[PDB]
Structures are given as structure tokens and as C-alpha cells.
Design a binder for this molecule. Structure first.
Ligand SMILES: *[C@H]1O[C@H](CO)[C@@H](O)[C@H](O)[C@@H]1O
Ligand SMILES: *[C@H]1O[C@H](CO)[C@@H](O)[C@H](O)[C@@H]1O
Ligand SMILES: [Zn+2]
Ligand SMILES: [Zn+2]
Lengths: 167, 167
């Protein structure tokens, strides 16, 4: 459903939700078939170990079961510098702000990637936190504190967006 | 008891066992009072998280209840290239080889530290494995795979020997 969203915003959300669904799907498949260290994994989740891999696998297994297209979207926020926000304990509802509309549908820090980010925050999906923001801090977190990286929303977004792409 | 141990090997073992008991005791106390990341813990057990700290705490809780002075020591092994060995499912018996007698009572890769290493192998004490050998590999294991570090014998020995000393 939509709340305070214009025709164009609903269309953008429709496209972003579908692309977010695909990101999560390809991301889950990747985690299920890659059970050893790979560039794409270590860059965003650090040194590969079974327990952490299971953690991220679980997050995507859960997010994959979500219906991004059925999320309750709210576009009343007009903050030009904010992308989106959610309440971890209030599942399926995403609040969009001004910066979301200026972001590309797919790619780095995209609308679709933003939904994957926010989705990971839901307690049902793993309850990720925001320990680091942006690709640079996300990669640094992966290198220095992998345990936090597998619990950081941006690291999930960047793992899914995979841009620049890695195997 | 002693199996094939001279009077000099027996008294040396009594000292090594007393010092090992002291290592395990101090190591347990440390683990009980340090419930947050510290250099001594992270160097040998990796990034601090409750579950991992609980694992090593348990190992030392059990090892502390062991009585090293009552271990059945066997001195028939004469392999100068190895310190000692045990069967995980055969508690309380340690087989010492040639290299053990050349080592110092306390310090890095000491007689006391070797007893801590071997003790951790007993299933009753946690059943650690030998994923890495030597300080360099042990530290590397701690940084790359914390889960394996808390289950690696050498990491326990070095945490206990604490040389160089760390807070
Ligand atoms: C993550 O780090 C590993 C090295 O451990 C590589 O597989 C990859 O290139 C990425 O930097
Ligand atoms: C273990 O690693 C931490 C860094 O996460 C340090 O605080 C400590 O000195 C040790 O290297
Ligand atoms: Zn966030
Ligand atoms: Zn061993």
C-alpha cells in the first residue's frame, strides 16, 4: 500500500521494490552456493567463517521471503538529505524522504539498494544496525570488525548492489 | 602417577603441573572479570562477542577444576622433536616426549604452558583441536577465524602464558 505517495513516486517504488526483490534473491542464491571465501563476500562481510556466513545467509533467507512489493510505503517525508527510515519493530513499513527520489533505481546507493538496507533493519530479517555508513566505512568495518559488518545494514546493501561487481 | 619417569622427571613434572594449575587459575579469573574486549583476549581469541567468551570461560572453568598434580604422566616417549601428546577421550594422562624436557618450566612454549595446551584437548575440558601451531599461526587464526581460535589448543596456551604480557 501507499501513504501520501504521488503517481510517479508509486511507480518509482514499484520499480525499486521489484529490483530490491531481485537483489535479495540473487544475493540469497549467491550465499547458498558460495561456501568458501570469495572477493564479493570478504569485501562486505570480512574473513569467511561458517558462523558469520550462516548469519548473512539467514538474513537473506528471511528477506527473500518478504514481499517488497507489498510493503506499506509512506512518502510524506520531504527531507531532501534523507533516503529512508523504518522502525525495526514495525515490519513491512518504509518511510521515504527527499533523497530517495533523487537516487537511481539500481546501482550504488540506489532506491532498490536502499530498500534492501532498510529491510535488513527489521527484527524479522535480522535486525541489522547502522554501525557504518557508506562504502568506505562499510569496507573498513568488514576488514576491522567482521562481526559488526554482518550486522550492518549498509554492508548488506553493498553486498547486494555489487557495484563495482565482484565474483 | 608416573610411568617410566625418573626422580628428576617427576620433580620437574610436579613443578610444571603446579605452574600449569596456576596458569589456568589466573586465566580463569581473568576471563571471569573481563567481560569486554581487551588486548590479551583479542590477540588470542579474536573479536570479542559473548558466545565466544562463554566458550573459553567454560574451557578454563573445567580446566581449573582439573588437578594437574594428579595427572598420570608417561615419560617413555623420547621424540626430541615433539613436546607431548594426549588422547582427547583418555582424560588425565599426558605423554611427554624429548622436547618437553628442554623447555623452561614457565614462559612461552613452556612445560607449564604445554600442560595447558594438552589439557584443553581433553573432551572434558572442551576438546580443542590443533587448527594452528605456534604464536604466529595462532594470532593469525585469532584474526581470521575467532571460532576456531577459541577451539585451538595453542591459542589457550598463549593466552595463559601471556608472554609478552598484555592487559
Ligand atoms: C576480501 O578479502 C579476501 C582476502 O582474505 C579476498 O578474497 C577478496 O579480494 C576481498 O578483498
Ligand atoms: C586484539 O585486537 C584488538 C583490536 O580489535 C586490540 O584491542 C588488541 O590490542 C588485540 O590486537
Ligand atoms: Zn540504516
Ligand atoms: Zn595439540
Amino acid at each position: 500500500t501507499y501513504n501520501g505517495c504521488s503517481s510517479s513516486e508509486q511507480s518509482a517504488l514499484a520499480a525499486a521494490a521489484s529490483a530490491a526483490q531481485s537483489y535479495v534473491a540473487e544475493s540469497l542464491s549467491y550465499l547458498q552456493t558460495h561456501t568458501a571465501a570469495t572477493p564479493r563476500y570478504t569485501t562486505w562481510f570480512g574473513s569467511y567463517i561458517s558462523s558469520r556466513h550462516s548469519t548473512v545467509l539467514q538474513h537473506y533467507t528471511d528477506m527473500n521471503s518478504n514481499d517488497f512489493s507489498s510493503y506499506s510505503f509512506d512518502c510524506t517525508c520531504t527531507a531532501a538529505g534523507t533516503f529512508a527510515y523504518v522502525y525495526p519493530n514495525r515490519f513491512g513499513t518504509v518511510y521515504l524522504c527527499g533523497a530517495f527520489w533523487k537516487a537511481p533505481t539500481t546501482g550504488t546507493d540506489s532506491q532498490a539498494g536502499t530498500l534492501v538496507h532498510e529491510s535488513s533493519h527489521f527484527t524479522r530479517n535480522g535486525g541489522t544496525k547502522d554501525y557504518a555508513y557508506g562504502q568506505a566505512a562499510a569496507k573498513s568495518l568488514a576488514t576491522m570488525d567482521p562481526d559488526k559488518a554482518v550486522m550492518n545494514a549498509d554492508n548488506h546493501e553493498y553486498f547486494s548492489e555489487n557495484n563495482p561487481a565482484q565474483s
